[PDB]
Design a protein around this ligand. Sequence first.
Ligand SMILES: CCC/C=C\C=C\CCCCCCCCC=O
Ligand SMILES: [Mg+2]
Ligand SMILES: [Mg+2]
Ligand SMILES: [Mg+2]
Ligand SMILES: [Mg+2]
Length: 141
Amino acid sequence: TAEVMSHVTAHFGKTLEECREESGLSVDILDEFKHFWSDDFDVVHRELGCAIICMSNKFSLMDDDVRMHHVNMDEYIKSFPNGQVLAEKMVKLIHNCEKQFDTETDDCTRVVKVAACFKEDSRKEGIAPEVAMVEAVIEKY
Ligand SMILES: CCC/C=C\C=C\CCCCCCCCC=O
Ligand SMILES: [Mg+2]
Ligand SMILES: [Mg+2]
Ligand SMILES: [Mg+2]
Ligand SMILES: [Mg+2]
């Protein structure tokens, strides 16, 4: 649901600053990770894909194939309030998006394409949070 997705994003997003230098992700491409969800942010830069790899690996959310680690992702989503309602759904959406981009050989590019797909499918499924909802939870933890 959109509130669980707001907690997930608020917490995950706290690793963006430490990942900027190695990914090339300028503040002028993305200032705060919560903007990922804005109507006006296009999820397209290779550098954002490199950043997401950096951020994921902090939490062991990717496996050694630079794809989502399903078990660690399920445990991560369950770590938030009401996480059990989102965990299986989110893992399903991300992995369906992964399958569409398997043929992309550049890991950074692949990951940003998966991320755009995930944003799209989350919006479609009604679980995409608004930027304001993410901001409302930024203080936590
Ligand atoms: C690894 C998933 C990132 C964890 C939580 C989600 C945060 C909000 C949006 C980030 C999109 C991540 C797309 C997964 C990419 C997998 O190839
Ligand atoms: Mg840190
Ligand atoms: Mg680099
Ligand atoms: Mg790892
Ligand atoms: Mg390349």
